[PDB]
C-alpha cells in the first residue's frame, strides 16, 4: 500500500500535479501523520536544514541535487512552500508526499505563508484555482497547514523555526504547550513565532511587517542561555549571500530560494549538520531554465 506513493513521488519530480482525489488521500495520510508530532519536533543530528522555497519548484530540484535525494539525506524545511512562485502546488505536494512516505527522514515546519489569508492574497489560492478549476485542493492544503509543527529542535542544541522569537515566549515548554491546530492569528505567541525577525537592535521592537516583533542580540542571548540552545536557525528573511549569521553567531538566517520572485537575483544556501553538528553551508545558484 505504498507503491502508489512512490509513483506519486516519481511523478511529482517531473513536475506533474496529482488529481484531486490523490491530493485528498495525501492530505488525509499527512494529517494522520502530523498529529503525532509535538510543536517542538525533535530531530536527530544528521540533517540538512533548508530555508524558504516559495514554490520555486525547479529551484527545489536544484536544492535536492545539491544536498542529495531523500530518504538518503535528512531534510528540514522551515516553512514557506507556497506563494511568490509559479509552481507552489507542485512544490507543496512533493514536500507533503515526501513527509508521508519518509516521515522520519524529513520534517516540515509551518511558515507564515501557511495561512488561509496569505494564500488567498499572494496567489497560492489563484494557482490552485487555475491548476484545478476549483478551490477544493486549496481547502485541503490549507487544512493541512494547521497541523504543521511550529518549530523543531536538532539534537537539543539547534532550534529551527521559520520566524523569530516572541516577548511572551521565553521557554521551549511554552512552545510545546501551544495549540497549533488553528489559523495564524494577528498577534499572540505563534503569530510572533512565525513572523518575527532579528535586528541590530537593543530589546524588542514593532516589526516593519504587519505582525511580529524585532528582537535584538541581547534577546537571543538570553533565550539561548535560558533554554540551553547554541543556535537559533531561522528562514523568514531574504539573504543575498544565501545565508547570514546574526547576533554574534546566535542566529543564522537561511534562505533556500535562489531568486525570490525570479527577479531579486539572490543566492541561496542550506546548512548541513553532520553526525557531530559540524555545520556546513552549501550555497547554490538558480538552475537553468528553458
Amino acid at each position: 500500500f505504498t507503491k502508489e506513493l512512490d509513483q506519486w513521488i516519481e511523478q511529482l519530480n517531473e513536475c506533474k500535479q496529482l488529481s484531486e482525489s490523490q491530493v485528498k488521500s495525501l492530505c488525509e495520510k499527512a494529517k494522520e501523520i502530523l498529529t503525532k508530532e509535538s510543536n517542538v519536533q525533535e530531530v536527530r543530528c544528521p540533517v540538512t536544514v533548508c530555508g524558504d522555497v516559495h514554490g520555486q519548484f525547479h529551484d527545489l530540484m536544484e536544492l535536492f541535487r545539491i544536498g542529495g535525494k531523500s530518504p538518503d539525506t535528512n531534510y528540514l524545511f522551515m516553512g514557506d512552500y507556497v506563494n511568490r512562485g509559479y509552481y507552489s502546488v507542485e512544490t507543496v505536494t512533493l514536500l507533503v508526499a515526501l513527509k508521508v512516505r519518509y516521515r522520519e527522514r524529513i520534517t516540515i515546519l509551518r511558515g507564515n505563508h501557511e495561512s488561509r489569508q496569505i494564500t488567498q492574497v499572494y496567489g497560492f489560492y489563484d494557482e490552485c484555482l487555475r491548476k484545478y478549476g476549483n478551490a477544493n485542493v486549496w481547502k485541503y492544503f490549507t487544512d493541512l497547514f494547521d497541523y504543521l509543527p511550529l518549530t523543531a529542535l536538532v539534537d537539543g542544541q539547534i532550534f529551527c523555526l521559520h520566524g523569530g522569537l516572541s516577548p511572551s515566549i521565553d521557554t521551549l515548554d511554552h512552545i510545546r504547550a501551544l495549540d497549533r491546530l488553528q489559523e495564524v492569528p494577528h498577534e499572540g505567541p505563534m503569530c510572533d513565532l512565525l513572523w518575527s525577525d532579528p535586528d541590530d537592535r537593543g530589546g524588542w521592537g514593532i516589526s516593519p511587517r504587519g505582525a511580529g516583533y524585532t528582537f535584538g542580540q541581547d534577546i537571543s542571548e538570553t533565550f539561548n542561555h535560558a533554554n540551553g540552545l547554541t543556535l537559533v536557525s531561522r528562514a523568514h528573511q531574504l539573504v543575498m549571500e544565501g545565508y547570514n549569521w546574526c547576533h554574534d553567531r546566535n542566529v543564522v538566517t537561511i534562505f533556500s530560494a535562489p531568486n525570490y520572485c525570479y527577479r531579486c537575483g539572490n543566492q541561496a544556501a542550506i546548512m548541513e549538520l553532520d553526525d557531530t553538528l559540524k555545520y556546513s553551508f552549501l550555497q547554490f545558484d538558480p538552475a537553468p531554465r528553458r
Binding site: R44, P46, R65, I66, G67, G68, K69, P71, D72, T73, N74, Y102, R103, E104, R105, L129, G133, N134, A135, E272, D274, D275, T276, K278, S280, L282, F284, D285
Partner: protein
C-alpha cells in the same frame, strides 16, 4: 419567466459570484442538451450576442464553450447561426478573449461546409474588416487564412484584396495583427498571387515607421522565404532583407539575427553568401548586446549550411576576425552566447585552422570570469577532441581542464566530470593514473551531491574501461578510506560507489574486498547508513557468490528487519524478498 429555464437561469447565475458564472459556462452544454436545438439557437444566441459585462474571467471560457458546439447547435446550417455571437465577443477589448474567439472561429470554419463557409463567413470577414473598432480588424486578421483553401476563385481574390486594404489601416495595432497573421496567410495563398498582392505592400509594411510592425514584418519575411521562385525571390526579398538587417531600431536587427538560420537555409547557399556576408558580420559588430548574442547563437547554424567549396574561405576571411573581437567583449552575456557553439566550427574549419585560430580562443574562454561562459564552452569537448586528436588537446587544454575542475560552480565541475570516460578511452592508463586519478578521487569528497554521483558513475566507467586490478591498486583504497569517514554523506558516497563498482568489478574481487567493508557499516548509529546498506546488499546481491551471499548477507538483513527505524525495516524486508 422563471418557468422558462435558459434565460432566467443563466441571468441569475450571472448575478451570482464569478466562479459560479464559470461553472455556468461549462453548464452551457447541459442547457443546450435539455432544450431543443432550435430553441437553443433562436433564444440563447441573441442573449449571448449582447449584455455582457464580465470581461475579466468568464469570456475565455465562454469562447471555448462556443467552440465546442459540435452537435449541440445542430450542424453547419446552424453553426453559421452560431457565428454572430462569436463576432460580438470578437469585438471584446481584452486581447486573450479575442485570441480564444478567433481560435473558436477557425475551428467552426473548419467544421463548416464549403458553400456555407463562403456564403456565411465572408460577409462576417468583411464586417470585421470594415468595423469601426480596430479590435474587429485585429480579430479579422486571423480568419483570412482558413477560408482560402476551400472557397472559389473570385471570393479568394476578394479576400486577398480585403486583407491588402486592411494592411493600409492607420492604427498600428491592426497592422501588427496583419503582420503576425501574414505568415500563414501567405503560406496558404498562391505564389503568383502572393508576389503580386502581398510583396509590394509587404515591403511597404517593412518600411513602416512603427518598430513593432517592423519586428512582425521580419517574422513574416523569414516565414515567406521559401515559396517564391529563385530569381523573383532575389529581386523581391534581398532589398527588404538588407533594409531590415541595417534598420535603425535595435529590436529589428535583433529579430533579423534571431531568425537567421531558417532564412539562410530557405534562399540557397550562394545567394546567402554573396548578399549576407557583410550583413552577418555587421550583426555581430553592432553596438547592442542583444543582437550580438543572437548572432553568436546563430553562428554555427549559419556556417554549417553554407556551400562547402567556399565555406572555409568566407569563414576565415570574414567571420574569424569578428569572433576574435567578440571574445573580448565587455558584456559577459554575449561571450556566454558565443561560447555555446564557438567550438562547433572546429570540424568544419579543419585540424590546422582550429589549432591556429580557435585553440587560443578556447583557452581564453576557459579562463573567463563569467561562469556562464565556462559552462557553455566546456559543453561540447567531444567534437573538438574527436577532430583534433588526444595528443594536441592533452598538450594544450589539459592543464586548463584541470584548473576548471577546481571551479566554484558545481555545474562547471560536473561538465568537466562527464568527459573522464571520453579522455580515458583515448588515453593510456599510466598517464591518467599519474595525472587525473587523484583528481577523480577529489570529486568524491565534494560538497555537492550531483558532483559525487557524477564521479561515482565515472568511476564505474573507468573500472569497466581501465580494467579491474588497476581499480584495486588505485580506486579501492580511497573508497575504503572513505568508509571510515565520520560524516555520513561520505559513507553514502561509498555505498553508491559499491553499488556501481560491484556490477563490473568481478565476483571474487567484489566479495573479498567490498563485503568486509559493507558488512561493518551495518552497525552504524545513523539509520540512513543502515537502510542504504540494506539497499546496497539488495542491489549487489545477484552479482556475487552464493555461499557468501547466504552466510553473510542473510543474518545481517535479519538483524536489520527487527531494527527500530521504519525505513530500515522496509528496505531490509524488500532485500530479503528480492534475495528469496
Amino acid at each position: 419567466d422563471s418557468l422558462y429555464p435558459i434565460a432566467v437561469l443563466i441571468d441569475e447565475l450571472r448575478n451570482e459570484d464569478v466562479q459560479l458564472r464559470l461553472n455556468s459556462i461549462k453548464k452551457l452544454s447541459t442547457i443546450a442538451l435539455a432544450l431543443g436545438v432550435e430553441r437553443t439557437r433562436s433564444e440563447l444566441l441573441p442573449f449571448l450576442t449582447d449584455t455582457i459585462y464580465d470581461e475579466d474571467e468568464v469570456l475565455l471560457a465562454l469562447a471555448e464553450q462556443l467552440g465546442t458546439f459540435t452537435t449541440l447547435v445542430g450542424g453547419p446550417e446552424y453553426v453559421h447561426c452560431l457565428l454572430p455571437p462569436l463576432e460580438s465577443l470578437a469585438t471584446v477589448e481584452e486581447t486573450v478573449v479575442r485570441d480564444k474567439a478567433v481560435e473558436s472561429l477557425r475551428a467552426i470554419s473548419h467544421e463548416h461546409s464549403p458553400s456555407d463557409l463562403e456564403a456565411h463567413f465572408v460577409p462576417l470577414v468583411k464586417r470585421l474588416a470594415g468595423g469601426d473598432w480596430f479590435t474587429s480588424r485585429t480579430s479579422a486578421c486571423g480568419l483570412f487564412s482558413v477560408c482560402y483553401p476551400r472557397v472559389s476563385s473570385a471570393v479568394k481574390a476578394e479576400l486577398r484584396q480585403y486583407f491588402r486594404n486592411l494592411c493600409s489601416d492607420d492604427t498600428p495595432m491592426v497592422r501588427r495583427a496583419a503582420a503576425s497573421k501574414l505568415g500563414e496567410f501567405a503560406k496558404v495563398l498562391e505564389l503568383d498571387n502572393v508576389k503580386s498582392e502581398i510583396i509590394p505592400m509587404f515591403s511597404n509594411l517593412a518600411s513602416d515607421e512603427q518598430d513593432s510592425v517592423r519586428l512582425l514584418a521580419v517574422e513574416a519575411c523569414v516565414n515567406i522565404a521559401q515559396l517564391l521562385p529563385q530569381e523573383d525571390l532575389e529581386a523581391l526579398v534581398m532589398p527588404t532583407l538588407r533594409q531590415a538587417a541595417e534598420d535603425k531600431s535595435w529590436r529589428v536587427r535583433y529579430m533579423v539575427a534571431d531568425k537567421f538560420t531558417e532564412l539562410q537555409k530557405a534562399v540557397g547557399p550562394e545567394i546567402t553568401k554573396t548578399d549576407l556576408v557583410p550583413a552577418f558580420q555587421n550583426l555581430m559588430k553592432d553596438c547592442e548586446a542583444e543582437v550580438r548574442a543572437a548572432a553568436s547563437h546563430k553562428v554555427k547554424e549559419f556556417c554549417e549550411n553554407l556551400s562547402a567549396d567556399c565555406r572555409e574561405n568566407v569563414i576565415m576571411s570574414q567571420i574569424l576576425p569578428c569572433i576574435k573581437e567578440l571574445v573580448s567583449d565587455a558584456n559577459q552575456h554575449v561571450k556566454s552566447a558565443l561560447a555555446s557553439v564557438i567550438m562547433g566550427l572546429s570540424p568544419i574549419l579543419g585540424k590546422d585552422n582550429t589549432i591556429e585560430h580557435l585553440l587560443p580562443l578556447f583557452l581564453a574562454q576557459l579562463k573567463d570570469e563569467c561562469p556562464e561562459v565556462r559552462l557553455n564552452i566546456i559543453s561540447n569537448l567531444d567534437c573538438v577532441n574527436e577532430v583534433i586528436g588526444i595528443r594536441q588537446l592533452s598538450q594544450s587544454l589539459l592543464p586548463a581542464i584541470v584548473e576548471l575542475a577546481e571551479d566554484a560552480k558545481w555545474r562547471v565541475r560536473l561538465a568537466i566530470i562527464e568527459y573522464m570516460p571520453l579522455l580515458a578511452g583515448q588515453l593510456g592508463v599510466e598517464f591518467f593514473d599519474e595525472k587525473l586519478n587523484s583528481l577523480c578521487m577529489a570529486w568524491l569528497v565534494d560538497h555537492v551531491y550531483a558532483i559525487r554521483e557524477a564521479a561515482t558513475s565515472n568511476l564505474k566507467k573507468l573500472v569497466e574501461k581501465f580494467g579491474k586490478e588497476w581499480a584495486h591498486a588505485t580506486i579501492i583504497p580511497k573508497v575504503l578510506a572513505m568508509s571510515g569517514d565520520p560524516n555520513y554523506l561520505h559513507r553514502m558516497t561509498t555505498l553508491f560507489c559499491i553499488n556501481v563498482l560491484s556490477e563490473v568489478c568481478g565476483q571474487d574481487i567484489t566479495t573479498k574486498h567490498m563485503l568486509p567493508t559493507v558488512l561493518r557499516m551495518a552497525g552504524d548509529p545513523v539509520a540512513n547508513v543502515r537502510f542504504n546498506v540494506a539497499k546496497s546488499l539488495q542491489k549487489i546481491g545477484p552479482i556475487l557468490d552464493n555461499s557468501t551471499l547466504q552466510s553473510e548477507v542473510k543474518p545481517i538483513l535479519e538483524k536489520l528487519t527487527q531494527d527500530q527505524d521504519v525505513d530500515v525495516k522496509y528496505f531490509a524486508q524488500e532485500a530479503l524478498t528480492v534475495l528469496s
